[PDB]
Enzyme design. Structure first.
Site, PDB file in Angstrom:
ATOM      1  CD  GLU A 124      69.564 -49.100 102.314  1.00 49.68           C
ATOM      2  OE1 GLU A 124      70.173 -48.061 102.026  1.00 49.68           O
ATOM      3  OE2 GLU A 124      69.829 -50.201 101.800  1.00 49.68           O
ATOM      4  CD  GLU A 132      71.694 -42.773 100.534  1.00 45.22           C
ATOM      5  OE1 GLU A 132      70.542 -43.148 100.220  1.00 45.22           O
ATOM      6  OE2 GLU A 132      72.735 -43.177  99.969  1.00 45.22           O
TER       7      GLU A 132
END
Ligand SMILES: [Ca+2]
Length: 237
Positions: A117, A122
């Protein structure tokens, strides 16, 4: 460098994201982080704005629950190396958790975190002036990814305008940047003897989560609905 793919999100207000590029993922099972939202395929949670942006909208419903959207390019656009970037105006508010990220293209044939990932951007709403870039892989995942943060250079909220969030990615190495400014690089040497799982194709994901272990949960300082606006996603090789 050459621009090999983009979605510029051209089209009238209310139009669907181009299905040649995008899938809608749906459901409210927590998404591995005790998230509250139900992701839907409704135009109320994802659509173009007629101004050249994709808009993902996180909403609160009358019963107190939440809806949002999670769009992926799985099986449609699967970059491997180069520069992967998006120009994004993030939402704001306690508990809000927008993201632009990638999952290894063999998921779920290969389970997470073995699939890899790459979190390009974010943000959590209690940190409006910070974004985080991370890698999850075997031995460096979940609560302990390879990670770091970048603060807005003047300490301002990223939600105020569009910013370009990117990774520059090559075999064995990934560099994160904001508005062209590189702030961290992680390589195969940084995994502490764990496998580097990023030398393979990935697909892209855009979403706005509501709540989760990391961001915490909405409170009185959270104003719904909240929009993440995306002017474009561009992939360079
Ligand atoms: Ca655009």
């Amino acid at each position: 460098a050459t621009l090999v793919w983009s979605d510029e999100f051209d089209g009238p207000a209310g139009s669907a994201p181009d299905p040649a590029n995008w899938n809608h993922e749906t459901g409210d099972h927590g998404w591995g982080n005790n998230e509250l939202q139900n992701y839907t395929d409704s135009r109320a949670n994802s659509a173009l704005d007629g101004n050249g942006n994709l808009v993902i909208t996180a909403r609160q419903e009358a019963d107190g629950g939440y809806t949002s959207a999670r769009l992926t390019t799985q099986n449609k656009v699967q970059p491997q190396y180069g520069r992967v970037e998006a120009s994004i105006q993030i939402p704001r508010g306690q508990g809000i958790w927008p993201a632009f990220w990638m999952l290894g293209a063999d998921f779920p044939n290969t389970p997470w975190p073995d699939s890899g990932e790459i979190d390009i951007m974010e943000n959590i709403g209690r940190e409006p002036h910070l974004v985080h870039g991370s890698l999850h892989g075997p031995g460096y995942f979940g609560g302990e990814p390879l990670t770091g943060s970048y603060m807005h250079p003047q300490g301002w909220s990223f939600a105020d305008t569009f910013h370009t969030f990117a990774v520059d990615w090559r075999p064995g190495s990934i560099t994160w940047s904001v508005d062209g400014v590189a702030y961290q690089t992680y390589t195969s040497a940084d995994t502490r003897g764990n496998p580097w799982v990023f030398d393979q194709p990935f697909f892209m994901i855009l979403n706005v989560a509501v709540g989760g272990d990391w961001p915490g949960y909405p409170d009185g300082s959270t104003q719904f609905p909240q929009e993440m606006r995306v002017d474009y996603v561009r992939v360079y090789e």
